[PDB]
Amino acid sequence: ESISTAVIDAINSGATLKDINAIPDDMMDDIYSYAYDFYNKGRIEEAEVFFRFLCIYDFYNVDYIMGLAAIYQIKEQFQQAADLYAVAFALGKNDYTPVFHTGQCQLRLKAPLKAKECFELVIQHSNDEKLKIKAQSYLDAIQ
Amino acid sequence: NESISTAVIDAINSGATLKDINAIPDDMMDDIYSYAYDFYNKGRIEEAEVFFRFLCIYDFYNVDYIMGLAAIYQIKEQFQQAADLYAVAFALGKNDYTPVFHTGQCQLRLKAPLKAKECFELVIQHSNDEKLKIKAQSYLDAIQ
Numbered sequence: 001e002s003i004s005t006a007v008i009d010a011i012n013s014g015a016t017l018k019d020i021n022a023i024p025d026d027m028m029d030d031i032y033s034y035a036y037d038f039y040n041k042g043r044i045e046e047a048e049v050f051f052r053f054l055c056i057y058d059f060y061n062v063d064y065i066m067g068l069a070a071i072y073q074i075k076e077q078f079q080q081a082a083d084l085y086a087v088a089f090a091l092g093k094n095d096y097t098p099v100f101h102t103g104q105c106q107l108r109l110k111a112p113l114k115a116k117e118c119f120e121l122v123i124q125h126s127n128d129e130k131l132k133i134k135a136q137s138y139l140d141a142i143q
Numbered sequence: 144n145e146s147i148s149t150a151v152i153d154a155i156n157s158g159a160t161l162k163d164i165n166a167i168p169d170d171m172m173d174d175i176y177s178y179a180y181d182f183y184n185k186g187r188i189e190e191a192e193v194f195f196r197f198l199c200i201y202d203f204y205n206v207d208y209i210m211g212l213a214a215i216y217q218i219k220e221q222f223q224q225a226a227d228l229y230a231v232a233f234a235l236g237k238n239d240y241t242p243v244f245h246t247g248q249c250q251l252r253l254k255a256p257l258k259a260k261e262c263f264e265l266v267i268q269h270s271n272d273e274k275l276k277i278k279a280q281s282y283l284d285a286i287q
Contacts, residue, residue, distance in 0.1 A: 003204045003235070011148045017234075026258065027230040034227040049203045052155060057234060059151040068155070083154035087147055 007056065018058040028058065035067060044074055062091045066098060078105040096126035100135055107138070116142055161201045172201070179211060191215055206235045213242070222249040240270040244279055256286055 010017050018028060035050035051068040058064055069084035082105040088098040103118035115138070122135035161167070179194035192215045198208035213228035226249040229242035236242060247262030259282070266279040 001237075007152060011146075011152065014145055014148075016148075021234060023230075023234050027233070030223075030227050031230050034224070045200065049200055053203055053231065055151055055155060059148040065151060072158075077158060080154050080157050083150060083157075087150050087154075090147065 003056075016058045016060055017056065018061075021057075023057070028054070032063070032067075039067065039070070044071060047071060060091065062088050062095070065091070069098070069101070073101060073105060076108070078109045081105050082109075096122050096128065096131065099126075100131060103135070103138060107142075112142060167201075176207070183211065183215065188215065188219065192219075203231075204235055206232050209235065210242070213245070217245065217249060220252070222253045225249045226253070238269070240266045240272070241275065244275055247279070247282060251282070251286070259286060 006017060006020075010020055013020070031050060032054060035047055035054060038044075038047035038050065048068070048071045051064065051071055054061065054064040055068050065084050065088045069081045069088060072078075072081035072084060082102050085098040085102040085105065089095070089102075092098070099118050100122045103115050103122070106112075106115035106118065119135045119139045119142075123132045123139070126132055126135070175194060176198060179191055179198060182188075182191035182194065192212070195208060195212040195215060198205070199212050202208060209228055209232040213225050213232060216222075216228060217225035226246050229246045229249070233240070233242040233246070243262050244266050247259045247266070250256075250259040250262065263279040263283045267276050267283070270276055270279070
């Protein structure tokens with residue numbers, strides 16, 4: 001019943017609401033398209049309600065969590081953004097983008113220490129060029 | 144163990160929300176809805192649209208809101224959006240397939256005959272609303 005109940009269950013139950021309600025994949029893909037669409041267009045308030053809905057209906061989806069964490073970061077909700085970034089990362093660990101962003105966040109949360117901890121790790125592990133350049137400047141600019 | 148889901152939900156739950164701070168009184172919420180709705184029935188679309196979007200932002204998990212907006216998009220022929228929102232309704236819905244039927248209508252006008260096909264099918268397969276399936280079938284046999 002009332003969407004919170006559905007959530008507590010799905011948690012305990014270990015599967016996503018997306019599965020539980022058996023929603024098509026072509027549906028969650030059209031919803032993510034729209035969500036993103038807002039996001040790019042800058043509309044953070046609209047983009048957030050879709051990314052929140054997607055994160056609820058599929059708490060395992062990296063693409064979704066990243067979407068929402070971007071949003072939290074934009075609105076300077078740094079801790080939340082970090083929390084979501086961590087998950088995104090555990091859910092991947094092949095991927096280093098959320099590691100960078102965590103760094104950024106640690107910074108704005110006046111924790112310079114942890115901040116560089118993440119940045120060094122990007123450079124070291126990400127094959128992503130554009131991403132090592134960034135990670136490096138933050139490391140140089142911090143000193 | 145996979146308290147991944149717990150973290151995601153706990154992080155999402157840290158922020159306040161319009162509905163969550165309890166600043167708007169219940170009767171006002173009702174009145175805004177009835178006006179939004181009422182505006183819809185009298186063909187005052189532009190306004191109807193603005194209020195339903197508000198309603199969807201105030202509570203995106205309330206199906207009557209998502210449908211209202213969805214239905215507005217459909218009437219305005221913004222079929223892909225109508226589709227996007229009926230998808231949400233469908234997901235919030237408890238076994239209701241009305242959104243799915245409407246998705247089908249939309250896909251049809253969006254030149255995806257093949258998607259249309261599976262919605263209608265999907266209806267017939269799982270819905271009870273008889274009146275509904277009777278249209279889902281009419282649509283099915285018309286595309287062929």
